[PDB]
Amino acid sequence: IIIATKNGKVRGMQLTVFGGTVTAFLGIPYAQPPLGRLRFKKPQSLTKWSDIWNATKYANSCCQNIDQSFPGFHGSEMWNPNTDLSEDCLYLNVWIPAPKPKNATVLIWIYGGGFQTGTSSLHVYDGKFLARVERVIVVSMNYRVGALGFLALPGNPEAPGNMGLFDQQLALQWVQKNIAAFGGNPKSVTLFGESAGAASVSLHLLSPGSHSLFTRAILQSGSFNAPWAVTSLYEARNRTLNLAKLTGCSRENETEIIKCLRNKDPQEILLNEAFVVPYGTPLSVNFGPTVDGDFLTDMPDILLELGQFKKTQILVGVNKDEGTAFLVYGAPGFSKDNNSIITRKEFQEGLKIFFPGVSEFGKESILFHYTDWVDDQRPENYREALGDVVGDYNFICPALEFTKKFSEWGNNAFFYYFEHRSSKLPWPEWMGVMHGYEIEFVFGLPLERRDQYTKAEEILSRSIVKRWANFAKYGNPQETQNQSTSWPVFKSTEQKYLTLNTESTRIMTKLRAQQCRFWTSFFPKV
Numbered sequence: 001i002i003i004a005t006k007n008g009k010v011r012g013m014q015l016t017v018f019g020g021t022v023t024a025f026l027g028i029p030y031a032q033p034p035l036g037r038l039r040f041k042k043p044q045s046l047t048k049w050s051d052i053w054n055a056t057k058y059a060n061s062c063c064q065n066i067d068q069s070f071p072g073f074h075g076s077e078m079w080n081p082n083t084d085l086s087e088d089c090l091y092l093n094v095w096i097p098a099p100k101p102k103n104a105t106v107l108i109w110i111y112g113g114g115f116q117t118g119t120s121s122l123h124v125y126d127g128k129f130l131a132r133v134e135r136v137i138v139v140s141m142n143y144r145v146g147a148l149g150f151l152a153l154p155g156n157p158e159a160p161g162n163m164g165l166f167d168q169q170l171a172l173q174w175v176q177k178n179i180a181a182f183g184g185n186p187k188s189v190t191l192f193g194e195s196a197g198a199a200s201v202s203l204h205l206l207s208p209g210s211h212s213l214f215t216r217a218i219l220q221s222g223s224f225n226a227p228w229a230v231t232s233l234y235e236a237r238n239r240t241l242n243l244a245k246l247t248g249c250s251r252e253n254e255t256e257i258i259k260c261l262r263n264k265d266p267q268e269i270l271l272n273e274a275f276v277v278p279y280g281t282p283l284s285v286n287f288g289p290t291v292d293g294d295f296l297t298d299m300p301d302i303l304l305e306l307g308q309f310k311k312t313q314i315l316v317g318v319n320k321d322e323g324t325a326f327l328v329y330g331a332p333g334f335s336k337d338n339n340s341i342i343t344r345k346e347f348q349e350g351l352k353i354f355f356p357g358v359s360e361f362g363k364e365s366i367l368f369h370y371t372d373w374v375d376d377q378r379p380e381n382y383r384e385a386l387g388d389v390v391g392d393y394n395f396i397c398p399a400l401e402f403t404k405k406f407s408e409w410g411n412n413a414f415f416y417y418f419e420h421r422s423s424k425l426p427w428p429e430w431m432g433v434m435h436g437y438e439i440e441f442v443f444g445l446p447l448e449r450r451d452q453y454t455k456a457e458e459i460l461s462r463s464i465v466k467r468w469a470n471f472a473k474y475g476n477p478q479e480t481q482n483q484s485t486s487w488p489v490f491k492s493t494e495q496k497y498l499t500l501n502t503e504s505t506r507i508m509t510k511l512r513a514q515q516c517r518f519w520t521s522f523f524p525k526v
């Protein structure tokens with residue numbers, strides 16, 4: 001019940017799951033709290049302690065803007081932080097099987113949230129089921145988001161960029177030095193994440209500093225080549241100087257702007273983050289990964305294209321309706337509280353909201369590719385198109401492109417397509433299989449049958465959990481026992497992928513091929 005780590009001892013707690021036991025260590029610090037002189041800088045290593053650290057409750061989340069478009073609605077508040085916000089937030093969690101395993105595969109979760117929001121303590125990232133059912137070890141960590149995590153004056157060590165990525169990387173290193181003490185195998189570590197988490201995992205594949213801190217990788221609705229995923233160095237410093245003036249910190253000694261930003265209080269920084277961009281989008285990443293020459297040594301689109309990444313197996317996939325979630329956060333004529341049948345002009349206006357700096361011709365090109373219907377008179381035509389438009393451009397095509405290019409260098413790749421709409425969901429049915437709603441299935445929440453989940457959902461979850469674990473332990477995401485359809489490796493030619501649902505598990509070919517040729521070849525040029 002007490003574990004001895006390189007920096008000191010840590011007390012955990014015991015949990016009861018499915019007639020068994022899991023040992024949870026919630027809130028182990030992995031770095032010096034980034035307060036004061038340290039705000040905006042890379043994490044600094046933690047100096048040892050002599051007491052017994054009590055890791056029995058989730059630690060503080062990093063400071064972030066909550067979104068308030070739906071106060072009181074669980075469909076949206078399930079994603080908001082469920083723990084005190086604070087700059088002092090560099091902590092991680094460990095769930096290990098009981099009894100203590102000997103050489104367990106380790107899964108390391110990295111949450112998404114547009115790089116502005118998110119926390120490891122969310123209910124739908126509870127690692128206790130994966131520990132219990134598959135006897136792997138699960139680790140999640142908090143990393144700095146928003147400007148306190150990704151503010152960038154390039155080359156300048158007071159605000160270098162990618163600090164949140166270096167937070168992640170320092171947790172990964174903590175697992176390397178320490179997880180053996182917990183009964184884990186540091187030579188068997190799978191990163192997995194979703195949305196910006198998945199884009200984070202993809203960047204860890206590119207970053208030499210993490211090459212040796214994990215084995216394999218799983219990308220859920222997210223990759224670095226997605227349009228939101230990397231902010232330019234043009235944009236980044238335009239953004240940190242607009243933050244400077246909004247807070248009365250514009251100077252000319254670039255480092256003393258930073259000194260000036262260090263005396264502001266967190267919430268002052270948070271209020272102004274939203275306006276350093278002129279035209280914003282529900283998907284807008286105001287402060288993101290940057291080519292800092294340290295974590296990321298070159299533009300990732302080039303590293304991907306020329307084979308400059310960790311060679312290993314990747315598991316990649318996306319959801320059928322990645323786009324809908326964002327339509328109710330800005331798009332006109334859209335509401336979670338009606339079927340949001342919009343018109344041709346509302347569609348048009350919804351493109352100017354999601355594609356704001358884009359030419360009139362650009363927005364006409366999108367409308368032309370997405371509005372030649374199998375039936376001109378279905379009222380929901382434009383509603384479905386704009387959903388598809390946002391999902392294809394922001395998630396599905398980048399993920400497919402990443403998998404093709406990665407697989408072109410000889411490693412096994414597996415692609416999936418999650419298409420199950422859960423029965424419980426608090427959002428209306430027109431929104432479909434939404435961004436982030438496979439996460440609970442990966443984490444085994446439908447296993448605790450309880451109130452929410454049909455037995456069909458319990459089974460799908462049980463299978464996904466097995467495929468994920470087999471991928472982590474063995475590099476091959478098969479379920480070998482219950483006469484399951486085999487999951488083929490994705491190769492650049494036939495582009496086979498697997499669909500996940502409660503009814504038919506089917507092998508299909510070339511997801512969204514016609515849509516994605518538009519996004520990945522034609523549209524980048526406008």
Ligand SMILES: *[C@@H]1O[C@H](CO[C@@H]2O[C@@H](C)[C@@H](O)[C@@H](O)[C@@H]2O)[C@@H](O[C@@H]2O[C@H](CO)[C@@H](O)[C@H](O)[C@H]2NC(C)=O)[C@H](O)[C@H]1NC(C)=O
Nearest residue numbers: 234235237238239241242243244245246275276277278279
């Ligand atoms: C780079 O930044 C400038 C300045 O941004 C403005 O000032 C900030 C403090 C904040 O209040 C922002 O909302 C402002 O936009 C941008 O120039 C502005 O461009 C917009 C229109 O696109 C408009 O607000 C003003 O006409 C401009 N303001 C000034 C002071 O010139 C500029 O567009 C940004 N982007 C690039 C690529 O340079």
Ligand SMILES: *[C@@H]1O[C@H](CO[C@@H]2O[C@@H](C)[C@@H](O)[C@@H](O)[C@@H]2O)[C@@H](O[C@@H]2O[C@H](CO)[C@@H](O)[C@H](O)[C@H]2NC(C)=O)[C@H](O)[C@H]1NC(C)=O
Nearest residue numbers: 328330331332333334335336337338339340341342343346
């Ligand atoms: C779906 O709902 C939106 C707005 O929902 C509600 O309606 C408002 C009157 C107000 O009470 C809001 O706070 C609610 O959330 C409808 O969009 C509105 O349409 C009319 C057109 O004149 C008008 O009230 C506004 O311009 C629109 N509001 C927007 C775009 O935000 C939409 O018409 C509804 N559609 C269907 C099919 O029910």
Ligand SMILES: N[C@H](Cc1c[nH]c2ccccc12)C(=O)NCCCCCCNc1c2c(nc3cc(Cl)ccc13)CCCC2
Nearest residue numbers: 079112113114116117195282283284285325329434435436
């Ligand atoms: N735009 C900025 C930055 C940002 C860019 N892209 C993002 C993606 C997610 C979160 C934030 C961002 C912002 O913070 N809010 C505006 C958009 C509203 C998003 C609310 C966040 N909650 C949800 C999340 C996810 N699934 C959701 C499903 C639905 Cl139905 C509703 C909310 C969701 C999956 C990953 C975790 C977060």
Ligand SMILES: *[C@@H]1O[C@H](CO[C@@H]2O[C@@H](C)[C@@H](O)[C@@H](O)[C@@H]2O)[C@@H](O)[C@H](O)[C@H]1NC(C)=O
Nearest residue numbers: 010011012013014051052053054055056057
């Ligand atoms: C650390 O925890 C020690 C033991 O706490 C035990 O577990 C918690 C969850 C409670 O149920 C408590 O009653 C138990 O005794 C404490 O004795 C010790 O003081 C704690 N140390 C610090 C620094 O908080």
Ligand SMILES: *[C@@H]1O[C@H](CO)[C@@H](O)[C@H](O)[C@H]1NC(C)=O
Nearest residue numbers: 102103104184185186187188
């Ligand atoms: C765990 O497995 C690795 C190889 O995956 C091996 O080198 C190591 O010695 C093992 N440690 C144990 C069994 O404690």
Ligand SMILES: *[C@@H]1O[C@H](CO)[C@@H](O)[C@H](O)[C@H]1NC(C)=O
Nearest residue numbers: 158252253254255256257259
């Ligand atoms: C002011 O700028 C110079 C470079 O022009 C820099 O070396 C110096 O450190 C800055 N001032 C302080 C107090 O850091």
Ligand SMILES: *[C@@H]1O[C@H](CO)[C@@H](O)[C@H](O)[C@H]1NC(C)=O
Nearest residue numbers: 459462463464466479481482
């Ligand atoms: C396989 O099927 C049995 C029932 O025959 C079920 O109890 C078990 O959980 C299934 N295993 C997986 C990994 O799906």
Ligand code: NA
Nearest residue numbers: 015024126128
């Ligand atoms: Na728990």
